[PDB]
C-alpha cells in the first residue's frame, strides 16, 4: 500500500466552504485507489485542511478526482471552491501540486504540475480527461445572440443560470445589489430635497451629486464651462477615442480661416496650423439615422418625453500653451444656413454654449453605447465565452486569461435585461434609449475591427500619438506604458510554453479558440465589414498581439472609459446624455432659459448620476491589474514572468503619480491600483 498526505486549500471567497461529504480518488501509473474519505473536520472558506489516507500504491501520481455528495438535507451551499490540492505519496520522492481555482459541484478532475499544450507528452488517461473536459465545456458554454448584427454572447436567461465559475462572487453580487439600493435611496432623498426647486441656473445641477458618495466632487464641476477644459476632456475624459488629427477639413464642414482666425495664437493661419499638426477633429457621422426616444430620427440636416441627438463635427486647436481648444462646431452633417458653423466668438454667447451641449449629447451616446458597452463589454464577451468553450483548464493561455475574463459574462447577462432591455437604464437616461440604442450598436458593430483594439496602432492611425504636436494626452501616455508592460509579460508567458511557431500551429485548442470567435463570435454577416478576427494562428507574435489587445481591453481600456464616468457625467451640464428640444435652424435664438429647457430635466440628470454611481462602484473584493493571487500557475518560469510584470506595473504607477503631482487635474484612471483585471461592472 501507500500512505497519502492530502492537503486541500479552500478559497476565501464567500460560500467557498462546504459540508458535503468529500472523497478523493487518486490515479497513477500503477493503477488507482478507490474513493477515499476526507471526513474529519470542516471545509471552511480560506481553510487549509490536512488528511491522511491509505490505499493502493498507484506509483507516480497522474491525476486525482474529487467527488462531493452534494450535501444532505441541512446543507445550505454544498458547492465548494477549491484553490488547490497538495499530495505526498509515501512511495514517491516528490510533492504533487494540483491547482484548481474553480467551483466543485459534484465531480472535479485535477492534474499535477505545470500547464501544458494539448500535444505536450502526458499519460493517455490525462489526455482523455482533458478531451472530456472540453466536451463538457461545449455543453455548458453556448453561443447566443441579440441579433444577426451583434457579437455572440453567452446563452443564459439570468445571472443565476450562469455556470458558477462565471457568476459574480457573492461579494460582487452584494456590491452591485447594495449599490442599486443606495441609488434608489439617494434618488428618493434627493427628489424630496429638490422637489419644488425652480431650475433656472447651470449651478442648480450641482445639488444632484451632493448626497452621493462618488469619491469626490466631479473634477470638471468647477471648470466645465471653460473652453480649455471642454477641449481637455477629448483627451482625458471618458471618451478619449474619437479625436483625430485633421489633415484637411471635410467637404461637409466648410470651416474657413475667417471662422477661426480669432482662436489661433501661434502666428499662423488655419491652413498652416493644419499642416503643422495642431488641428484636430471629431466626426460623429455614425449617429446619422439614430432613432431617439419618442420618435425623432436624425438626418444629415438634423431634424424635420421626446429626446434628440446629433451627428456633429467639431474642430480643435492646440494653442501656444499646449491646450486643446474647441474652435468650431457644426451640429449636424449637412452644412448650410440652417446648420451653420458655431465658434467661441458667437455674437450671442448662449449660441456657443448650446453648440457645445449638442456636441456633448452626441459624445455621451457614442461613448456609452459604442466606446463603452459595445467595444469593451459585448465584443470582448465573445472572447471570454470562447475561452471557456475551447481552452482546457490545463492550458497556459486559459490560466493567463482566467483573471482577465472574470466578470464580463456575469455583468453582461445582468445587463442584457437591466441596461438595454425595454424600460431599462438606457431607456431612461440616453437620448437613444427606447430602442434606437440597439440599432445604433448594431450599426457600430458592422464597422468593428479587432485592429481597433491595438492601442499603439489605433493612436498612430488617428494621428494622435505625437506628444510634440498634441501635448497633455495622459490616456495616451499611460495607456502606451501599460500596453507595453502587458505585451512584454504575455510574450514571456508564450515563450515558456510555445517554443516556436510550429507549437502554435499544432495547438488545436488555441486554434479552436480563435476560430470559434472568427466564425461564431464576431460574425461577418450581411452588411458587415471584415471584423479582423483571424481564422487561425500562424505565429507566436500573432498570438501575442491578439492576447495583448484582449487583456488590455478587459482591464485598461474598460477602466479608462468606465471609471472616468463620475468626473465626466457627475455634473450634468459637463456632459448631457439627453437633450429635449431640436437644434436651432438659425443664429441668435439661444437664451439661458431655452438652454435649460433643452438640457436634461432634473429627474433625467439624477438618473444619469445614479447610473454612473452603480457602473463605477469598485467591489470590496476587486482584484486590480496584475494581482494574480487567485490564479492557477505552477510553472516557476511563469511565476518569474509574473514577478517582473508586477514590478514593472509598480514602476509605472510611481511614474504616473509623480506625473500627476504637477498636473492641475491629475489623470488617475489608468493607475494599475485602480484598473481591475477584468470588465466586471
Ligand atoms: Ca459552499
Ligand atoms: Ca482539519
Ligand atoms: Ca511572486
Ligand atoms: Cl485503494
Ligand atoms: Cl503552470
Ligand atoms: Fe463597464
Curated annotation (Swiss-Prot):
* Membrane-protein topology: Peripheral membrane protein
Location of the region described as Arachidonate 8-lipoxygenase in the Swiss-Prot/TrEMBL record: 2-681
Residues that bind Ca(2+) 2: 18-19, 41-42, 44
What GO MF annotations does this protein's record show? allene oxide synthase activity; arachidonate 8(R)-lipoxygenase activity; heme binding; iron ion binding
Question: What are the protein's UniProt keywords?
Answer: Calcium, Cytoplasm, Dioxygenase, Fatty acid biosynthesis, Fatty acid metabolism, Heme, Iron, Lipid biosynthesis, Lipid metabolism, Lyase, Membrane, Metal-binding, Multifunctional enzyme, Oxidoreductase, Oxylipin biosynthesis
Query: How is the activity of this protein governed by pH, according to its UniProt record?
Result: Optimum pH is 7.0.
Q: How is its activity regulated?
A: Lipoxygenase activity is stimulated by calcium, sodium, lithium and potassium ions. Calcium binding promotes interaction with membranes and thus facilitates access to substrates.
User: Any idea where this protein resides?
Assistant: Cytoplasm; Membrane
Q: Tell me which residues make up the Lipoxygenase domain.
A: 116-681
Q: Which reaction does it catalyse?
A: (5Z,8Z,11Z,14Z)-eicosatetraenoate + O2 = (8R)-hydroperoxy-(5Z,9E,11Z,14Z)-eicosatetraenoate; (8R)-hydroperoxy-(5Z,9E,11Z,14Z)-eicosatetraenoate = 8,9-epoxy-(5Z,9E,11Z,14Z)-eicosatetraenoate + H2O; (5Z,8Z,11Z,14Z,17Z)-eicosapentaenoate + O2 = (8R)-hydroperoxy-(5Z,9E,11Z,14Z,17Z)-eicosapentaenoate; (4Z,7Z,10Z,13Z,16Z,19Z)-docosahexaenoate + O2 = 10-hydroperoxy-(4Z,7Z,11E,13Z,16Z,19Z)-docosahexaenoate
Q: What does this protein's record comment on cofactor binding?
A: Binds 2 calcium ions per subunit.
Q: Where is the PLAT domain?
A: 2-115
Q: Keyword Cytoplasm: yes or no?
A: yes
Q: In which pathway does it act?
A: Lipid metabolism; arachidonate metabolism; Lipid metabolism; fatty acid metabolism
This enzyme's EC code(s): 4.2.1.-, 1.13.11.40
**Named cofactor requirement(s):** Ca(2+); Fe cation; heme
Q: What is its main location?
A: cytoplasm
GO terms, biological process = arachidonate metabolic process; fatty acid biosynthetic process; lipid oxidation; oxylipin biosynthetic process
Tell me, how does this one assemble?
Dimer.
**Family statement drawn from the similarity comment of this UniProt entry:** In the C-terminal section; belongs to the lipoxygenase family.
Biological function: Bifunctional enzyme which is responsible for allene oxide biosynthesis via a two-step reaction; first the lipoxygenase reaction that converts polyunsaturated fatty acids such as arachidonate ((5Z,8Z,11Z,14Z)-eicosatetraenoate) into a (8R)-hydroperoxide intermediate ((8R)-hydroperoxy-(5Z,9E,11Z,14Z)-eicosatetraenoate) followed by the allene oxide synthase reaction that converts the hydroperoxide intermediate ((8R)-hydroperoxy-(5Z,9E,11Z,14Z)-eicosatetraenoate) into the allene oxide (8,9-epoxy-(5Z,9E,11Z,14Z)-eicosatetraenoate).
The name on file for this protein is Allene oxide synthase-lipoxygenase protein
Q: Which species expresses this protein natively?
A: Plexaura homomalla
- Which span of the entire protein is present here? 374 to 1066 of 1066
Amino acid at each position: 500500500h501507500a500512505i497519502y498526505n492530502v492537503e486541500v486549500e479552500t478559497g476565501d471567497r464567500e460560500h467557498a466552504g462546504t459540508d458535503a461529504t468529500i472523497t478523493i480518488r487518486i490515479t497513477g501509473a500503477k493503477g488507482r485507489t478507490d474513493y477515499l474519505k476526507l471526513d474529519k473536520g470542516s471545509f471552511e472558506a480560506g481553510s487549509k485542511e490536512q488528511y491522511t489516507v491509505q490505499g493502493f500504491d498507484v506509483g507516480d501520481i497522474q491525476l486525482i478526482e474529487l467527488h462531493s455528495d452534494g450535501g444532505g438535507y441541512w446543507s445550505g451551499d454544498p458547492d465548494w471552491f477549491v484553490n488547490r490540492v497538495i499530495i505526498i505519496s509515501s512511495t514517491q520522492d516528490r510533492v504533487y501540486s494540483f491547482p484548481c481555482f474553480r467551483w466543485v459541484i459534484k465531480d472535479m478532475v485535477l492534474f499535477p504540475g505545470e500547464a501544458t499544450l494539448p500535444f505536450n507528452e502526458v499519460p493517455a488517461i490525462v489526455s482523455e480527461q482533458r478531451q472530456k473536459e472540453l466536451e463538457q465545456r461545449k455543453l455548458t458554454y453556448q453561443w447566443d445572440y441579440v441579433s444577426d448584427d451583434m457579437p455572440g454572447n453567452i446563452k443564459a436567461k439570468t445571472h443565476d443560470d450562469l455556470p458558477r465559475d462565471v457568476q459574480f462572487t457573492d461579494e460582487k453580487s452584494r456590491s452591485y445589489q447594495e449599490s442599486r439600493k443606495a441609488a434608489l435611496v439617494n434618488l428618493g432623498i434627493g427628489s424630496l430635497f429638490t422637489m419644488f426647486e425652480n431650475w433656472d441656473s447651470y449651478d442648480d445641477y450641482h445639488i444632484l451629486y451632493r448626497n452621493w458618495i462618488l469619491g469626490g466632487t466631479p473634477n470638471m464641476a468647477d471648470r466645465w464651462h471653460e473652453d480649455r477644459w471642454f477641449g481637455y476632456q477629448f483627451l482625458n475624459g471618458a471618451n478619449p477615442v474619437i479625436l483625430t488629427r485633421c489633415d484637411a477639413l471635410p467637404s461637409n464642414f466648410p470651416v474657413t480661416n475667417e471662422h477661426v482666425n480669432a482662436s489661433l495664437d501661434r502666428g499662423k493661419n488655419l491652413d498652416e496650423e493644419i499642416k503643422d499638426g495642431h488641428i484636430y477633429i471629431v466626426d460623429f457621422k455614425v449617429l446619422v439615422g439614430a432613432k431617439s426616444y419618442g420618435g425623432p430620427v436624425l438626418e444629415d440636416i438634423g431634424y424635420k418625453d421626446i429626446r434628440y441627438c446629433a451627428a456633429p463635427l467639431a474642430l480643435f486647436y492646440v494653442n501656444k500653451l499646449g491646450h486643446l481648444m474647441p474652435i468650431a462646431i457644426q451640429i449636424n452633417q449637412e452644412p448650410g444656413p440652417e446648420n451653420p458653423i458655431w465658434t467661441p466668438h458667437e455674437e450671442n454667447e448662449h449660441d456657443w454654449m448650446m453648440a457645445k451641449f449638442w456636441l456633448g449629447v452626441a459624445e455621451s451616446n457614442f461613448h456609452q453605447l459604442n466606446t463603452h458597452l459595445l467595444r469593451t463589454h459585448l465584443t470582448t464577451e465573445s472572447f471570454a465565452l470562447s475561452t471557456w468553450r475551447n481552452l482546457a483548464s490545463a492550458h497556459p493561455i486559459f490560466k493567463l486569461l482566467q483573471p482577465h475574463i472574470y466578470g464580463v459574462l456575469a455583468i453582461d447577462t445582468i445587463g442584457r435585461k437591466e441596461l438595454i432591455g425595454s424600460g431599462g437604464i438606457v431607456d431612461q437616461s440616453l437620448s437613444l434609449g427606447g430602442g434606437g440604442h440597439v440599432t445604433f450598436m448594431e450599426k457600430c458593430f458592422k464597422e468593428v475591427n479587432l485592429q481597433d483594439y491595438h492601442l499603439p496602432n489605433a493612436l498612430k492611425k488617428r494621428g494622435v500619438d505625437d506628444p510634440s504636436k498634441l501635448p497633455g494626452f495622459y490616456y495616451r501616455d499611460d495607456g502606451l506604458a501599460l500596453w507595453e508592460a502587458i505585451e512584454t509579460f504575455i510574450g514571456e508567458i508564450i515563450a515558456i510554453f510555445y517554443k516556436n511557431d510550429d507549437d502554435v500551429k499544432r495547438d488545436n485548442e488555441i486554434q479552436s479558440w480563435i476560430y470559434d470567435v472568427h466564425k461564431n463570435g464576431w460574425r461577418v454577416n450581411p452588411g458587415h465589414q471584415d471584423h479582423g478576427v483571424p481564422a487561425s494562428f500562424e505565429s507566436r507574435e500573432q498570438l501575442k498581439e491578439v492576447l495583448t489587445s484582449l487583456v488590455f481591453t478587459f482591464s485598461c481600456q474598460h477602466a479608462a472609459v468606465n471609471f472616468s464616468q463620475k468626473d465626466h457625467y457627475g455634473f450634468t451640464p459637463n456632459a448631457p446624455a439627453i437633450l429635449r428640444h431640436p437644434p436651432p435652424k438659425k443664429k441668435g435664438e439661444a437664451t439661458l432659459q431655452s438652454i435649460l429647457s433643452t438640457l436634461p430635466s432634473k429627474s433625467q440628470a439624477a438618473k444619469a448620476i445614479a447610473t454612473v454611481y452603480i457602473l463605477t462602484k469598485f467591489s470590496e473584493d476587486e482584484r486590480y491589474l496584475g494581482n494574480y493571487s487567485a490564479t492557477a500557475w505552477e510553472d516557476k518560469d511563469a511565476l518569474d514572468a509574473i514577478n517582473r510584470f508586477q514590478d514593472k506595473l509598480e514602476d509605472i504607477s510611481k511614474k504616473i503619480k509623480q506625473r500627476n503631482e504637477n498636473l492641475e487635474v491629475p489623470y488617475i484612471y489608468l493607475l494599475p491600483e485602480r484598473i481591475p483585471n477584468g470588465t466586471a461592472i
